[PDB]
Amino acid sequence: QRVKLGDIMGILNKKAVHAAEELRPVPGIRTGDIVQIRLEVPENKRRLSVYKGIVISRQNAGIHTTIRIRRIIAGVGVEIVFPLYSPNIKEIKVVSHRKVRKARLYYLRDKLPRLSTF
């Protein structure tokens, strides 16, 4: 039988994630994880950037599933979002995991610097 029209969103959403997973698997990430991301930069060719920090959110949106990474560089706080299933991301690690009690760590924007330094 064919595919019903009310389900095509899930199929395309499920199909792309399956292709990206076999091409590049990804572990299970939750709020509070401390990760280390390696992503290709088409501007240069030789090396790749290395961004790390604590996960302060995880928005589930299918193929465009995101994670926000807070980390303090050069004394100033910096929050960056990363789509998990992008082809630019070459490698992800999970260094450790902090104990938390919420889904989104927005309070750290007002807390001290040491809570986000790495």
Partner: protein, 221 residues
């Protein structure tokens, strides 16, 4: 109006993203297709004074149709269908009834396309949302906050000008989005992917036809 080519009709299903090989993101809109996309009638200048062709869509149960509409479709031996729209052209020498219209034969890849459908109905809205008027002060004793203000000069002219931008119904009408790039085709699922937004919510009808440009495709005047 005169169209540059022949289009079809589909239904909005939703909206999502599309990751390229290099990694660029593309906000893409999805459009499905029901069963029926068959031609119903062919018009000519000898009969109607203009050249065009009808197209039906969204097959349904026969009992739901009015009996006049049945005879219109039963002439060409065509299944029952709900909607009907035309596509005006310059020449219709290569079209007949009972003819299917596959979109992949007409829209291959990266082709600009003019989407058209019904917008979201906002209802009886004011001037700030409809006509983008500015707002009055919220403090300093002002009584008028979201009102229009003056609607005329005074004794001269002595009446309100016609077509004055005033409240009323907003949305729910027909629009057309021009020059949208097609990203990908998928004949397995019978679905098409187009960059950008589309008027309406999922389940809404629309027509997509080749992009018409003034001096290139259509006859100038």
């Amino acid at each position: 109006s005169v169209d540059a080519g022949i289009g079809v009709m589909g239904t909005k299903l939703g909206m999502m993203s599309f990751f390229e090989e290099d990694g660029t993101v593309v906000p893409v809109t999805v459009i499905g297709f029901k069963e029926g996309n068959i031609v119903t009638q062919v018009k000519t200048e000898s009969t109607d004074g203009y050249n065009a062709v009808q197209v039906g869509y969204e097959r349904l149960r026969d009992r739901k149709l009015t009996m006049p509409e049945r005879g219109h479709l039963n002439k060409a031996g065509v299944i029952p269908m709900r909607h009907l729209q035309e596509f005006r052209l310059v020449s219709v020498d290569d079209f007949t009834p009972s003819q299917k219209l596959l979109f992949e034969e007409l829209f291959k890849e990266g082709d600009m396309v003019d989407i058209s459908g019904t917008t979201i109905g906002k209802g009886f809205q004011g001037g700030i949302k409809r006509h983008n008027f500015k707002r009055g002060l919220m403090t300093h004793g002002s009584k008028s906050h979201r009102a229009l203000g003056s609607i005329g000069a005074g004794t001269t002219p002595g009446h309100v000008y016609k077509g004055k931008k005033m409240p009323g119904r907003m949305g729910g009408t027909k629009t057309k989005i021009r020059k949208l790039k097609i990203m990908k085709i998928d004949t397995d699922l019978r679905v098409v992917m187009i960059k950008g937004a589309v008027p309406g919510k999922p389940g809404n009808l629309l027509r997509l036809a080749p992009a018409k440009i003034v001096g290139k495709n259509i006859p100038k005047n």
